[PDB]
Design a protein around this ligand. Structure first.
Ligand SMILES: *C(=O)[C@@H]([C@@H]1N=C(C(=O)O)[C@@H](SC2CN(C3=NCCS3)C2)[C@@H]1C)[C@H](C)O
Ligand SMILES: *C(=O)[C@@H]([C@@H]1N=C(C(=O)O)[C@H](SC2CN(C3=NCCS3)C2)[C@@H]1C)[C@@H](C)O
Ligand SMILES: [Cl-]
Ligand SMILES: [Cl-]
Lengths: 267, 267
């Protein structure tokens, strides 16, 4: 009935902003979970960049790539919303800086460079996810063309649950060894775009790492986080939202609130 | 809870001047440590010169260089802020005097000459740091071009903790033998640029050695010190700051104060 309360509250929250909320949350210490529409599909938006950065680190760990190797792109027509890569166009960036920029600022140039040169594009990004046991994740299109968030369209979607499980495996589990996993955590922790989302749902002294996404269409936005509460086992939180109409704006407040409800449901 | 008090105080200090403070402090006699954002990246500015001078002494100890060998530079266009090297342009300087000038007066000419001729430039400076167990330190650019302190930019950064540990290894530990380490200490002790920073945070009869840095952009400044309190085991203090806006000035007062808080936290 703690589950059922949380569910009634997400249902009301989704009715209040006239859309659709998907949640999955894990207490990694007890194994307690809460889910709401946790098996429905939602657009990834930029959020897949968190997994792209893990993919790079996997390669670095296998010695397939070096984290300090220069990635040059002096001639590239940089995609919209490349605030980091724009600054370094002249000198290039380390693969590590570039992958972290893809995560921390949602840099589309970092994203697309890495997928075209190192990861085998959308298909390869999908293969990476299948290789960690994730069967729902599909990336179909490149950084800027995946944000259409069309209702019923399965392209570039996952489920809240798949997102949660995957983050758990990558951030807390055994895909990355001790050294490289720590780097991944530092990267998540240093995310700059999620202050109004899961971060806003927790005490200021809890440590958080997240990646956000915002399609800019159908009010579609999301956020996923590893949370370290004071003196407690990590939590995994995964919140995906969409909305009725093409022109609707996303609601940060709904994401923060659905996170609050989720964190309470596994308390 | 003494840790947590110190942390609340640094957080308020950082909010008051609208920036970001990173701290790491070690009591070498108990092993007690305090840190605040001790794993986040901050620009080195000139501060790496302290490690550059250690690198030189390492080479001297290995018999790769002689501390009294004449370094001539009669034709060089000396970089801005070379007060010592400007004075000796005609005659040259000993490698020892030159390295100490790079430390004590933050002489950019001494800095760049030494990196280009003896240390293998920024990458060699970084290799030196890796070789003492420092995995966070990166030097990417040369003396005058590393002071841009752009938010988000990982070039020429370390963490307060990495800086503290490294200083401990170099100033108090086993990298340099007893004779050469004493030289290094004398050098640190004779620093002339840090009267308003960590030095200002401690009784005037405590003996201090430090290296400062001031990027002159984004209010970015730092200081790191070995402190000998009378009749107590050494302390290591490491304070890094940045600020929100490009035109903000650095705050010596914030550095001195964050040092006071740090030294109390490990008391
Ligand atoms: C490096 O940071 C830059 C030079 N190093 C500085 C430093 O060591 O703090 C700055 S600021 C300079 C020292 N100073 C003093 N004020 C109080 C008494 S001495 C002004 C300096 C520019 C170089 C340019 O990279
Ligand atoms: C991908 O979703 C998308 C990127 N991703 C974004 C995101 O939320 O991660 C941005 S939305 C923008 C970044 N914002 C903030 N950063 C500082 C405070 S809030 C709002 C952007 C649209 C596509 C278009 O690349
Ligand atoms: Cl999507
Ligand atoms: Cl492409």
């Amino acid at each position: 009935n703690k589950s059922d309360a949380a569910a009634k509250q997400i249902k009301k929250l989704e009715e209040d902003f006239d859309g659709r909320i998907g949640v999955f949350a894990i207490d990694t210490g007890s194994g307690n979970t809460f889910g709401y529409r946790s098996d429905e599909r939602f657009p990834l938006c930029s959020s897949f960049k968190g997994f792209l950065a893990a993919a790079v680190l996997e390669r670095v760990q296998q010695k397939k790539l070096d984290i300090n190797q220069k990635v040059k792109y002096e001639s590239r027509d940089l995609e919209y919303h490349s605030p980091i890569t724009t600054k370094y166009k002249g000198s290039g960036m380390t693969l590590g800086d570039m992958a972290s920029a893809a995560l921390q600022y949602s840099d589309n140039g970092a994203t697309n460079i890495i997928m075209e040169r190192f990861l085998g594009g959308p298909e390869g990004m999908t293969k990476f996810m299948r290789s960690i046991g994730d069967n729902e994740f599909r990336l179909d299109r490149w950084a800027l063309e995946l944000n259409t968030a069309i209702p019923g369209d399965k392209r570039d979607t996952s489920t809240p649950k798949a997102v949660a499980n995957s983050l758990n495996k990558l951030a807390l589990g055994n895909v990355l060894n001790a050294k490289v996993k720590a780097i991944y955590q530092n990267w998540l922790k240093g995310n700059t775009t999620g202050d109004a989302r899961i971060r806003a749902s927790v005490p200021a002294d809890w440590v958080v790492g997240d990646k956000t996404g915002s399609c800019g269409a159908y009010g579609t936005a999301n956020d996923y986080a590893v949370i370290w509460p004071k003196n407690r086992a990590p939590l995994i939180v995964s919140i995906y939202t969409t909305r009725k109409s093409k022109d609707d704006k996303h609601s940060d407040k709904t994401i923060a609130e659905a996170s609050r409800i989720a964190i309470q449901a596994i308390d």
